[PDB]
Structures are given as C-alpha cells and as structure tokens.
Amino acid sequence: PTTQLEDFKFWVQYAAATYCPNNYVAKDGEKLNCSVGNCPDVEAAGSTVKLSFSDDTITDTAGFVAVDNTNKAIVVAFRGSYSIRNWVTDATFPQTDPGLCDGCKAELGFWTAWKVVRDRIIKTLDELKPEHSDYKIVVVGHSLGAAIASLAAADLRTKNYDAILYAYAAPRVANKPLAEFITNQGNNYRFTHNDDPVPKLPLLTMGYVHISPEYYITAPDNTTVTDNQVTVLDGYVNFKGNTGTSGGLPDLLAFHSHVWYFIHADACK
Amino acid sequence: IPTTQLEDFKFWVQYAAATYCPNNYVAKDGEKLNCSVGNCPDVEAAGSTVKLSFSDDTITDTAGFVAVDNTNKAIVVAFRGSYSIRNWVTDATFPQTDPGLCDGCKAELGFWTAWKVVRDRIIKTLDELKPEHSDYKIVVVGHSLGAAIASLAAADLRTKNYDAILYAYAAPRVANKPLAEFITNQGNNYRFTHNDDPVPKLPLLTMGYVHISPEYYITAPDNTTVTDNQVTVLDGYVNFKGNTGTSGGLPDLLAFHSHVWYFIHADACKG
C-alpha cells in the first residue's frame, strides 16, 4: 500500500531538509539530517548529499542534490530566501524570457536563482545516471524554494530529465503561456494551505497565473493532513481554494498558514 | 530659525533610522551617531553622541541607544525592534500582560518584555545625564517594532516623572483600551502611519488592542518629499479614516513597501 497522500507527506521532508544549515553545506556522501526532527523518514531512508549549494552572493538560494537508495530517487531540493519582507518590499516582480516556449515569461528573481545553480545540478544529474539509472528525479521545494523548484522542473524536463515536481506553498512563477506549458508537462504537485498569503504573489494583475492543478490543504496548523483535507482544483486561476481566501488579498497575519504543509516545513531554521 | 511641526517630524525619524545601523547599537560611550547609508544627515550635523548602547540578541532581538544631542538640547532614547516580521507574526498570537501602569491596563507582552530588559540601564543613564543636561527634552523614538517598544517605554518613563516625548513611526498597537487612553492623555505623542502599511494594523482589534491617539496619517507616495497636505491628524482609539481603513481593513502583505518609507527610507541602514 502506497497512497498519494503518503507520497505528499514524504517529499516535503526533503524541502524541510533544505532549511538545515548542515545540509546545504554538506560534502558529497554526507547523510541528510534535520536536527529539529522534521525529516525522520529521510533519515530512515539513509539519503545522502551528492552536491550541496549555498548562495551567499546574489539569490540567497540554498539546497542540494541528494540520493535516496531506499526509495530509488534523485532529489533536487531548493530553499529560497527566508526574508519575506525583502522579497516583497520593492513591490515589483518583473518577468523575463526563460527560453522555454513561445511567449513564455518567468519571474525574474526565481529564474535567475535557478540559472545560478543549473549547470552544477545538470552535471551532477549526469554523473549520477550510470549507477542510479532507473531512479526517479524529484524536484522539490517549500515557499520561495518551491518557486525555484517549479522553474527548475520545467527547464529540466525540456532537457529530457523526467522531473516530478513537488512545490509546497509556491508563489506564482509564470505568465499564462508558461503556466500552460508547465501544466501540460504533467507530474506537477503544487500545494497551498488555507489562507497562506504567499501563493497569492506575484499578483494576477502583474501578469502571473499558477501551474494547474492546486492541491488545496485545509487541515489546521500542526495537525496531520487527512485525505478529506486535500482538495484538487483545476485551472491557472481558481478562486475556490487558496486564491479566494481573505477576499483575494495576501493577509500578512495569515502567514502562520505558510509554514505548515503536512509538517512544520521551515522548522530546521 | 523658524521651524514647522513637519520639519520636526522629519528630524526625529533620523534617530529611528540610526537604530538600524549596527555601529550605533554596539557603540561605546563617546562615539558619534552615524549612518553608513546616509539617512541620518541632520543627526550627524547635530553632533549627537552615544552615551549608552544596548543590544539583546538572546531573547527579545531589541537594540538601540541613549544619545545626547547638544544642538537640539535633547536626550534621545531610541529603539530598534526585531527585523523579522515573519517571526513576529508566525504564531498569530499576541498575549497581553499587566505593565503596572494604570487600572485595567494591559500591554503587548513581547514589546513590554523588550522594554523591561533594557529599562534599568536606560533609567540609570537618564539619571547620570540629568545634572549637566538638566533642561533637555527627553525624546523616545523608534520605527516599526522599535516604535512599539518606544510607545511603552515612553508611557512607563512618564509615570516615573521623565517628561518623555514620543515619536513612534509605523508602530504596531501596544495597548488595550484603558492603557491606550492612559498613554493618549499623557500627551506629547506622535504616532505615524503611512498609506496602507500593514504593520500598524497588528495586533488586531479583535485581540483586544487599540491605538494611542492621535494618528498622524501620511499619504505621500514612497520616496517623495512629504508636504503638510500629506499629513492628516486623526484622533480616536479606533479610526477607520486613516491607515486602519486601508486594504478593506486587512494587513496586506504586498503593502509592506509602505512600511519602510516614513519621510525617509527608515530602515535603509540595515545591511
């Protein structure tokens, strides 16, 4: 027995692991571990880092490529910037051309963050193929890291890496053509939680929409998510679910909802 | 030289700005206040000097200084609160505590705790400065969460006979209704809001908090010179015609840009 919900509860632990300072400086061969105890199934699987990355310089991006020999997965996991105020204070989100498809545009900050690490990650994936050949490729993040993961998965797929995307609490990354492009790639699991303000940014009026579908989590904070607390909603814009909460506004006081996606996602700091 | 109230308001915010500069809140006695990013030029022109600095990196994430301004004949007590807004709101709970200031009065626990950690040092310093500065104003100032700490510090200091003048730029609520009425009627309160800034809408009215009155509601665009026509004085403990009524009454995360522009770029010195 393996259910979609159990799957969702697992991969978020790799997103959680990207917040741990020891994991995104880890040497090749080092076991992933989360000192606060929020990635127990990752530790149980014995997953090790292949390559870690930490950007001090530009994007404040961190993460790793890890190998899970238990579940036969290569995991590409991203942490974005922790400062939400720094992300929104300019109140501007310019787009850029990622070179993926006709008329497609992506959020400049997130696309840049991916570009900075893309070549290391592709090189690492190539090195791993021979002894891991039948492994699935999982691309995962939470919060701003989930935005980077969304674009990373989109790009990796055009390069023939069959990437399965788990984007927990993701901001919008794409204009309408790019959202349609990514949606049509399939293997997209994008999550929202109650009134979390972050998936409502950047705004619809800024020319962004979402990858479809939305996996809308209605469980309370710090509770296990059950099967009737996840609702699947189709469309690049859907006002049932997270986008319709708080009258459509990104409520600052709803931020508590951002950190609970099946688990306390950022608890490792 | 003749000066206006608006010019006064544009000056004290530069002390708030100075609390974001790490050099100022670790400074030893005798170091000149200065802001590397250049947003406190009139403080530097006044030659203002640190008497005591304080920084708590352990529990409250509070920092600031007591400085002497001999040009303007003021002793300035300035606070920086926690810079992480997400950490401040993530619990979504804002418990009240009894500050011992007045009957039925209650204050926000976090901000009251922050003041209590530095209160003894600050009073010691005010007392040391008094004999050679005896006729100086005592100005208590902050921006953002620091403005909340300043609000409660001023309230407390006044009950101790220090005639504190409060400049609270972009302050969160700190008080329940009895405490807000008490602080308001002490007078010498200048609390500012700017357009749709979300921070002055927290904690919620429904959590038992109200604001000190009046509100100086700034409606100028970001990064522009504010004129008298762009500052509106609104009294009352809850007033829906200023900042509290913006964004349909909700704290809009995307309105955060409004929080950092209070006459100047208030937090620019955080690097």
From TrEMBL, chain A:
<dbReference type="GO" id="GO:0030600">
    <property type="term" value="F:feruloyl esterase activity"/>
</dbReference>
<dbReference type="InterPro" id="IPR051299">
    <property type="entry name" value="AB_hydrolase_lip/est"/>
</dbReference>
<comment type="similarity">
    <text>Belongs to the AB hydrolase superfamily. FaeA family.</text>
</comment>
<dbReference type="GO" id="GO:0016042">
    <property type="term" value="P:lipid catabolic process"/>
</dbReference>
<keyword id="KW-0119">Carbohydrate metabolism</keyword>
<keyword id="KW-0378">Hydrolase</keyword>
<feature type="domain" description="Fungal lipase-type">
    <location>
        <begin position="75"/>
        <end position="204"/>
    </location>
</feature>
<dbReference type="InterPro" id="IPR029058">
    <property type="entry name" value="AB_hydrolase_fold"/>
</dbReference>
<dbReference type="Pfam" id="PF01764">
    <property type="entry name" value="Lipase_3"/>
</dbReference>
<keyword id="KW-0732">Signal</keyword>
<keyword id="KW-0858">Xylan degradation</keyword>
<protein>
    <recommendedName>
        <fullName>feruloyl esterase</fullName>
        <ecNumber>3.1.1.73</ecNumber>
    </recommendedName>
</protein>
<dbReference type="GO" id="GO:0045493">
    <property type="term" value="P:xylan catabolic process"/>
</dbReference>
<keyword id="KW-0719">Serine esterase</keyword>
<feature type="domain" description="Mono-/di-acylglycerol lipase N-terminal">
    <location>
        <begin position="1"/>
        <end position="50"/>
    </location>
</feature>
<keyword id="KW-0624">Polysaccharide degradation</keyword>
<feature type="disulfide bond">
    <location>
        <begin position="20"/>
        <end position="268"/>
    </location>
</feature>
<dbReference type="InterPro" id="IPR002921">
    <property type="entry name" value="Fungal_lipase-type"/>
</dbReference>
<feature type="disulfide bond">
    <location>
        <begin position="34"/>
        <end position="39"/>
    </location>
</feature>
<dbReference type="Pfam" id="PF03893">
    <property type="entry name" value="Lipase3_N"/>
</dbReference>
<feature type="disulfide bond">
    <location>
        <begin position="101"/>
        <end position="104"/>
    </location>
</feature>
<dbReference type="InterPro" id="IPR005592">
    <property type="entry name" value="Mono/diacylglycerol_lipase_N"/>
</dbReference>
UniProtKB/TrEMBL annotation, chain B:
<feature type="domain" description="Fungal lipase-type">
    <location>
        <begin position="76"/>
        <end position="205"/>
    </location>
</feature>
<keyword id="KW-0378">Hydrolase</keyword>
<keyword id="KW-0858">Xylan degradation</keyword>
<feature type="disulfide bond">
    <location>
        <begin position="102"/>
        <end position="105"/>
    </location>
</feature>
<keyword id="KW-0732">Signal</keyword>
<feature type="disulfide bond">
    <location>
        <begin position="35"/>
        <end position="40"/>
    </location>
</feature>
<dbReference type="InterPro" id="IPR005592">
    <property type="entry name" value="Mono/diacylglycerol_lipase_N"/>
</dbReference>
<dbReference type="InterPro" id="IPR002921">
    <property type="entry name" value="Fungal_lipase-type"/>
</dbReference>
<dbReference type="Pfam" id="PF01764">
    <property type="entry name" value="Lipase_3"/>
</dbReference>
<dbReference type="GO" id="GO:0030600">
    <property type="term" value="F:feruloyl esterase activity"/>
</dbReference>
<feature type="domain" description="Mono-/di-acylglycerol lipase N-terminal">
    <location>
        <begin position="1"/>
        <end position="51"/>
    </location>
</feature>
<dbReference type="GO" id="GO:0045493">
    <property type="term" value="P:xylan catabolic process"/>
</dbReference>
<dbReference type="Pfam" id="PF03893">
    <property type="entry name" value="Lipase3_N"/>
</dbReference>
<dbReference type="InterPro" id="IPR029058">
    <property type="entry name" value="AB_hydrolase_fold"/>
</dbReference>
<protein>
    <recommendedName>
        <fullName>feruloyl esterase</fullName>
        <ecNumber>3.1.1.73</ecNumber>
    </recommendedName>
</protein>
<keyword id="KW-0624">Polysaccharide degradation</keyword>
<comment type="similarity">
    <text>Belongs to the AB hydrolase superfamily. FaeA family.</text>
</comment>
<dbReference type="GO" id="GO:0016042">
    <property type="term" value="P:lipid catabolic process"/>
</dbReference>
<keyword id="KW-0119">Carbohydrate metabolism</keyword>
<dbReference type="InterPro" id="IPR051299">
    <property type="entry name" value="AB_hydrolase_lip/est"/>
</dbReference>
<feature type="disulfide bond">
    <location>
        <begin position="21"/>
        <end position="269"/>
    </location>
</feature>
<keyword id="KW-0719">Serine esterase</keyword>
